[PDB]
Design a protein around this ligand. Sequence first.
Ligand SMILES: *[C@@H]1O[C@H](CO)[C@@H](O)[C@H](O)[C@H]1NC(C)=O
Length: 343
Amino acid sequence: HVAHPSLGRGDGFPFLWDNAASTLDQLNGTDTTIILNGFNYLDRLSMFKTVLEGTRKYFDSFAPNNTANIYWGFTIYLNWILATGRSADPTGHTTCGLAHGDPMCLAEESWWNCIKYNPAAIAFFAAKKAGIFGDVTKTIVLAKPKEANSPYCSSEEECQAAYPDVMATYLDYFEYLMSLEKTGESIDMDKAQQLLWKAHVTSMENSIAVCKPRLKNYNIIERQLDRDYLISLLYFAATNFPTNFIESIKFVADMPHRQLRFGDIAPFIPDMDMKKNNLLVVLHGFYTVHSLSGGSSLTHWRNLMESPVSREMARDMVNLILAGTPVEVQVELAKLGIPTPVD
Ligand SMILES: *[C@@H]1O[C@H](CO)[C@@H](O)[C@H](O)[C@H]1NC(C)=O
């Protein structure tokens, strides 16, 4: 049994989905503690699954099996980083995440692990604080990293102190959900999605500098994919594109199913379909507009995306992209009136 990059266990749900905890009471611990290893795939999956379960009631009517829940995004991406080897140690110094080592271990040295840790762990703490899990008197005890002055926080208090804006933005999301029963209002899906994206973006922006050195652990082609993806995510987030089950699977199905290497040039990678080859070009297209504009294009894009009509039009573009339609990022952005750069 191994994780499939886009199908997870087989039907889109993550590898080992059934094995992960639905509630805090199913986790290991003591009378006064709950134990979680943030460097273990199953415990990270439990950080997502417990929040999915605890927020199911807000999304239940919209679709079966909690599939309308917008928390699926980073849950599905956890499966993908495992399945494609991107959570393993890339340095060769340890066997963490390798088949001949502990395949569930998530390496400190992994760039993907580095950027994705907080959207699991800090978000989990924020959900706890907001009351998503009910009243919890037990202390969360996280496994500590080995590296001194690590980018990985290992307690509720340390995470708050090191990444205050990330804690605050995820808290805003969960507090909004918690407010709905007092009012008796049904969820405003566009608002909920905006709040969650704001937290994800804040996390990415708070991690980019501290995770940057890990990019040097990968060859230049894989390294550039990593950069391309993080910048592109900032543009996608501003469109308010949905992060529910079906849309998340649609995205990961277009991502490369293996690490890239020297020799790979999109859109001519012969062991990948046209949709994967096309998304690789598009991600680099966003990187290029961003780099050549000194980052100014993102500021203009965000201003434009203050309009709900603009956001809907931009989501239409994203859907074309996900279907494998070969659109030129630079050309499409200009159409939307973004001042675009020359070299
Ligand atoms: C939920 O998903 C499971 C697994 O894919 C499926 O067998 C089942 O039909 C779905 N449940 C409902 C109520 O639609």
